[PDB]
Amino acid sequence: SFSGYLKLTDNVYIKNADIVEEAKKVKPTVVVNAANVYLKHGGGVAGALNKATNNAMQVESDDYIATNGPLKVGGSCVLSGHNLAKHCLHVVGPNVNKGEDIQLLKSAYENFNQHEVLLAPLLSAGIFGADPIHSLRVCVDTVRTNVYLAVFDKNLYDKLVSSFL
Numbered sequence: 001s002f003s004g005y006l007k008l009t010d011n012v013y014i015k016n017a018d019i020v021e022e023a024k025k026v027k028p029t030v031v032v033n034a035a036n037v038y039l040k041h042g043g044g045v046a047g048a049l050n051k052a053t054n055n056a057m058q059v060e061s062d063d064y065i066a067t068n069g070p071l072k073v074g075g076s077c078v079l080s081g082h083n084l085a086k087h088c089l090h091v092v093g094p095n096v097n098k099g100e101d102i103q104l105l106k107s108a109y110e111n112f113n114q115h116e117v118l119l120a121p122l123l124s125a126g127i128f129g130a131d132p133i134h135s136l137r138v139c140v141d142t143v144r145t146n147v148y149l150a151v152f153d154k155n156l157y158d159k160l161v162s163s164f165l
């Protein structure tokens with residue numbers, strides 16, 4: 001039921017869309033969150049997804065952290081998708097603004113391979129500070145399952161499509 005996506009490869013699709021609106025429309029089995037190790041969904045994609053859940057994502061996340069401790073950079077956990085999806089896969093890409101190793105972006109994308117189909121943002125893009133062109137490249141070269149990428153910014157979406165090798 002994903003509609004309006006441009007096909008980049010055999011398994012990677014892209015659309016200029018607000019991932020919250022896309023999740024509400026599609027109700028995918030998995031929506032990926034651009035999480036941090038503490039699951040503190042303050043801003044960027046995480047802040048927007050959490051706000052769409054009326055903070056239920058944050059309440060669930062705080063209980064998860066209280067039980068399990070923080071995630072690793074490059075790691076993930078599966079939690080509820082609330083009103084957005086069946087599940088939310090919280091994936092921690094490296095935050096270059098915190099000096100985290102950009103080489104961990106491939107490990108972060110490997111989490112997507114545990115799910116046959118996902119709605120996702122570009123990991124480490126936006127407020128995480130990585131080059132979104134590089135994130136898309138790592139995505140296509142790492143993810144083998146079906147990934148539907150939602151890119152919020154039209155100007156960035158156009159740049160990503162027009163520069164895609």
Ligand SMILES: C[C@H]1CNC[C@H](CO)C1
Binds near residue numbers: 001002027028029
């Ligand atoms: C598994 C269902 C979850 N919501 C959308 C799916 C259609 O691609 C069906």
